[PDB]
Symmetry: D3
Subunit: 151 residues, 6 copies
């Protein structure tokens, strides 16, 4: 079912390079539905909770400028976004994908999408970055043509 | 070089306003449009189109779907046209389809999978889907000069 | 139904691979395709379409142009569609059309000027040109659901 | 420098355009400085469209800006208010020049995609930003690219 | 006739922001034919020689980084490139022009094309920035469809 | 971060209006143009480039092609630049190239396959190709600011 959600973040390199609209439209175009978005700075203390799993370089980077955090909704949202991003290392990512098209590095890899193979990391990572009041429930009319949900 | 395939923007792609994006993708590839009709598909054309799925539980929905709004039907011409269009389309189920494909960029669904192209691994499916959707006189026979640069044999 | 205008991609934009680029503009504007035909145009039809320019000295070159290879003929529906298309297209001589318009971005010639649209300043010209290039069973009547978001009155 | 309030109204969210609008402001060289996807309530809507509590189209105007979520933003830059009104195009998308956001995307007065604080209404930028966003939601930052957008940061 | 040529260039601000191809695309999409193109850095002498008519901000800007210098051929190309570029102050430039869509300053105004009203300027700036051997004389078949008399 | 590769939009891509498209793709990847030259290759330069192929049947059709019209020659710099350009080009036969690669989206032929990149699996090809088409006066050392957001190691 189509209420599944995932967490997607455009990282400081994305935001610095002016790629947020680019990332947003590839997810829109795919038919996924935005339920949360905010342009925020991440504090060392929040970085520490996220990457609680080179640790102090990936903190220095996730905290080096503004991020644009998002929640995205739709069928198999977590897999779909993670297919769309291509391999985490943008140097091995396939052309067509976000990292394969805009990226040329491991640490500055444009974005984060929750991992579909670490179960629940989708709900863990949205609880961490958003509260239930920064999240919207609405019906995207065009989802009737995105899926058998149709007239 | 005269190979022809039949290609259709399905009701879902028409509704989401991707007729243009899709055409662009096919002329961008180097393929020549030789027919193009914006039409509604009748219940019998649809039974004929999905005939091979007559025995199947998923045959009512298909037919409801494809007749649920207009399509933009097309024929494209080019070297190895049929497979080419199947490569740009992506896997039948959009969810399994590589980004960079029509279905992988635009679709998230098996049923509403945006588009159809004749199956290359089913000989004569291409010319049969053409005759089905198009009369002889609707197909247009032209010399697009930009093929001298799309194709080494036309140079 | 709403207002409707004849829109045509001309032989030059078909040859240059811009059909999809042109369709996309009218689609993302909010306009609804209602007719669409890839076709060739003969001198006869060309004489009847540019009937009014028969005396002028650029008639014979004009007719030779739109018969010089295929076109992509369409009908578009929406609020004020005849006017909106002509603003999208821009001034008739592409060298004077403004960037952002089809002709401004895509052409620079007045004869080879990419697209034709019904003249909203010429009463009923839209309806006459629609009836010329299409018949009623070629014009799909449908409900484009995203029109509820394009238009307040429709919602 | 200047900041402005720009909103993708519910028609633009629904139609899947928030990426396109955001891109056009990015490539113009302006700096996103806040942004937030949210549902507007009737209170906030009555307050934003308070210049028109008197007109007949008010009741319907407020039904629209609360009919679905919007994407609420703040952008910084040289003349950021005239410029984002310049890119938006005329209020009536039907008269909006092609090239602008309403001229390319819109075909209507009431569903006209986007809002951008009026630049003739001195202080509607600060007021409208003050109305949609608290200052904790606003990120100060130095965008290294602005050194090539502007010959005052070079 | 169709042999009119004009000089065009992507100024350093445009090279730094990765808009070389966006600008080239706009000009080829208009039907102009490229006959010269060279990625290059402008020494202060050539700068002074290019800006003869005029100044201290200019020189410092145009030598500030590499440019992409071009020459395009087509009907009324000088005028058409000027219309496509937009108003020198990119803040007064209309959306749909290069400066309208990309620029927010007049120092950093993305690009230069020869003034069509300053007669002979096209042939001068060309003849300055390119040796005649670097200008390519070819027939773009697509021009038979760009232009009626070339049909 | 200092590795360089030669890349060249071939006569077909030049002729079809794709220089900008290709240049955008590489720019967008975060690679850095360091040289760039619109030019005609003559028979002898085409022989030096495709010397590794005097032997084969297609040799003479290949230099025929590579000299049939101007090309746009380039050098790009970036981490792993030779291999990244090849990943973005796709397979050399365009008909096998995955959609989303250059040859995948834009081509439909073997000979007319749009673009050349230095083969990363041939040590020294990138530098030999660069030295052959360009001199060092033409290559530009400059510092791309955005690099410090493309690559972690540059910040
Ligand atoms: Ca069948
Ligand atoms: Ca008729
Ligand atoms: Ca009839
Ligand atoms: Ca050399
Ligand atoms: Ca030498």
């Amino acid at each position: 079912d189509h209420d599944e959600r995932t967490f997607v973040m455009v990282k400081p390199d994305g935001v610095q390079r002016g790629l947020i609209g680019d990332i947003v439209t590839r997810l829109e175009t795919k038919g996924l539905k935005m339920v949360g978005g905010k342009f925020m700075r991440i504090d060392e203390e929040l970085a520490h909770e996220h990457y609680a799993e080179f640790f102090d370089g990936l903190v220095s980077f996730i905290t080096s400028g503004p991020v644009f955090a998002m929640v995205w909704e739709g069928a198999d949202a977590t897999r779909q976004v993670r297919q769309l991003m291509g391999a985490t290392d943008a140097q091995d990512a396939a052309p067509g994908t976000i990292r394969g098209d805009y990226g040329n590095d491991l640490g500055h890899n444009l974005i984060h999408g929750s991992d579909h193979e670490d179960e629940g990391a989708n709900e863990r990572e949205i609880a961490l970055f958003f509260d239930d009041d920064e999240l919207v429930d609405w019906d995207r009319d065009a989802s009737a043509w995105v899926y058998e949900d149709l007239a």
